[PDB]
């Protein structure tokens, strides 16, 4: 009634992005994948399997607790159905402070359901298999028990509506793979598989130290100047901070900022805390070691898990959560100081690069005034 | 229904004329609170004896569900309080030992209480309900707001039910409340008396070890290191602590989901089998004679032994409705295997203790044999 999918069908782009260039189409997958993975931080979901089917449908299978199946006393339909049909039911029902669900972005499976011509939901929970079918968001029958199972978890298979999605209606394996890998880099210990039924292509993304692995991927076609990547994965006051960095022989700076898996193009408090810690730590090391009074060649990832994050806008390109500056700055001041002393072979190379770049920047400015 | 319980009360709580049933009323409520603790929801239980001979039990659990049961039209809490086996039906926790007569929970306590007050703190609000001989005076209703979660059950035992012994004995409550804290390490159990201001606080991080230290407090241990462990493998939690004293009595206290087994069972059997194999393998290794090894196997009567064997088993099976003998065949294997492994590490880790214990066991067998031969040779 009041809370429904009519809003979504009328203005799809507002919720998932542009429906005519393939961005919205691929985001449909990542809205399902975000609902799967958000259950990972508390240890419920351990493995997500994403499959591109021959019929241009995508299924997402997890091994979580399974979406609740109990009849909502007010709505009179299964808790999973309430979530699928009531636009914001999911985000409201979920207690998880780390899930970033808003009015338009990150709404979840209900958005996917609205723009899907058909949706199949399969829930393994309490030793029973529950199945449901949806057509343009309308259930065909109530969620029903079809069998028995030893496993728990949810499976959502969706067929994008062709009345919504134009021009690009086929999933690009590479778009899915790049984001699924990143998600596994940012959520260590989580297993994410990508399968393609059109050609048999598949990948498996699983890292025990995803933050380190992320910087090794960013530097694979580069020339790292020091052998040891500086990384850490800490949790303090409900704020998880992961950082990995390594200098290359290059002259560009590339810091990749993330807050609850969401990229921050324009940075924020996590970047600022990272920068302040690096300047204080490198200045402290150069002071103490005798080197007299944006960083060329830096490749870094700053990934935070913060409950209820705050952003500068609807785009979520700048993190504004003040407590995240301190949370990042504190840990990186402590642990990068330890890294420089524990790896003086690496620390010599890094400082050597910073000084040579300062010698070149100053001499290049002086060469301008010369002629 | 609760008319059956009111018609034959002692069948459910025990006899209503000697204070056994009366005190069991407390412990049934306390057990419904404790079952939330293994899950990790309930951290503290406060038991209070009120000056009006009512007992209140308060926990910091999740609070009994308040939502309307779509089939019953009344709150899930009310369905649990009024319908006998509703509590054990709704609760998916297999470790909860809900019997047909004994251990049905608060519903039995309610049916036999002339007044019962239930206060649930859940989902940011306080809900209250008043019961009279089992019948609710109004449906569960929100009275106020709260930041805390938990359940409070205050009950006034019926004087038409409980005769001769209608006053709560602090010692009966304290003794069992302490035992329950030994068997559920990490759980805080406070006991208060409003009649004299008397209070106790039972909390142990190593309850199984502490239990044996309490049992050996007015005795003389012959070895300083208590053998103890607390493990879980394939849903069976096994806690064993043991220590020998200079005495000639054997006392092995067996427990299954807090319920004591007077006549032992598969946990006692798994304990005895582990002990025999481990003492026989140690004696084989240490170079003991065939006579000294026979002297320490033949009969399982360990003079000077004090042991506690407590098990957490989902859905245990007993020889009868008394629960005096565990019959769950899979518990022997769980006890036996974990004790064979860890008792063998103990004997190696503490070889002073190992030599004292074996020494004692053979010595008592040599003395009993010596007494038996002295009996034979007497003119
Ligand atoms: Cl593999
Ligand atoms: Cl205290
Ligand atoms: K919420
Ligand atoms: K490291
Ligand atoms: K997210
Ligand atoms: Na963003």
């Amino acid at each position: 009634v009041l809370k429904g999918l009519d809003a979504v069908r009328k203005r799809p782009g507002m919720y998932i992005g542009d429906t005519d260039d393939g961005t919205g189409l691929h985001h449909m997958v990542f809205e399902v994948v975000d609902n799967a993975i958000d259950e990972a931080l508390a240890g419920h979901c351990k493995e997500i399997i994403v499959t591109i089917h021959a019929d241009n449908s995508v299924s997402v299978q997890d091994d979580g607790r399974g979406i609740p199946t109990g009849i909502h006393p007010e709505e009179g339909v299964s808790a999973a159905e309430v979530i699928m049909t009531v636009l914001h039911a999911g985000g409201k029902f979920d207690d998880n402070s780390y899930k970033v669900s808003g009015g338009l972005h990150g709404v979840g499976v209900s958005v996917v359901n609205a723009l899907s011509q058909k949706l199949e939901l399969v829930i393994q929970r309490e030793g029973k298999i529950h199945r449901q079918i949806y057509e343009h968001g309308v259930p065909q029958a109530p969620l029903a028990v079809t069998g028995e199972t030893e496993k728990t978890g949810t499976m959502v298979r969706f067929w994008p509506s062709l009345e919504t999605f134009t021009n690009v209606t086929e999933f690009e394996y590479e778009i899915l793979a790049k984001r699924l890998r990143e998600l596994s880099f940012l959520n260590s210990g989580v297993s994410i598989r990508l399968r393609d039924k059109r050609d048999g292509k598949e990948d498996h993304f699983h890292y025990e130290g995803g933050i380190k692995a992320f910087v090794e991927y960013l530097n694979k076609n580069k020339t790292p100047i020091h052998p040891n990547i500086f990384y850490f994965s800490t949790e303090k006051d409900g704020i998880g901070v992961e950082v990995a960095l390594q200098w290359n022989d290059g002259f560009q700076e590339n810091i990749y900022c993330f807050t609850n898996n969401i990229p921050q193009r324009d940075g924020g408090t996590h970047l600022a805390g990272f920068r302040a810690a690096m300047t204080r730590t490198l200045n402290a090391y150069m002071d103490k070691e005798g080197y007299s009074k944006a960083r060329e060649g830096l490749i870094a990832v700053v990934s935070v898990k913060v409950p209820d994050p705050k952003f500068s806008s609807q785009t979520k390109d700048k993190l504004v959560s003040s407590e995240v500056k301190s949370a990042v700055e504190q840990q990186m001041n402590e642990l990068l100081a330890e890294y420089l002393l524990e790896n003086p072979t690496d620390a010599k190379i890094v400082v050597g690069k910073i000084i040579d770049a300062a010698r070149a920047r100053e001499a290049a400015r002086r060469a301008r005034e010369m002629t």
Side-chain angles (χ1 to χ4, degrees), chain A residues 300-340:
Chain A
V301 189
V302 180
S303 180
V304 297
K305 276 182 177 79
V306 60
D308 305 294
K310 290 109 153 178
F311 301 93
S312 100
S313 67
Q314 291 173 253
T315 64
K316 302 172 268 200
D317 288 323
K318 204 173 185 182
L319 178 75
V320 131
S321 277
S322 195
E323 74 274 9
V324 180
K325 202 206 195 274
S326 341
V328 176
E329 193 172 339
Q330 166 193 247
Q331 300 285 339
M332 218 194 131
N333 266 329
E334 200 204 308
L335 305 171
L336 177 66
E338 280 175 44
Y339 163 85
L340 298 165

Side-chain angles (χ1 to χ4, degrees), chain A residues 229-232:
Chain A
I229 300 177
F230 163 67
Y231 70 100
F232 73 85

Side-chain angles (χ1 to χ4, degrees), chain A residues 137-158:
Chain A
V138 169
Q140 300 308 282
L143 180 72
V145 171
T146 56
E148 288 183 81
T149 185
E150 287 282 295
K151 317 166 178 178
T152 64
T154 315
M155 196 287 291
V156 161
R157 188 151 147 209
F158 73 93

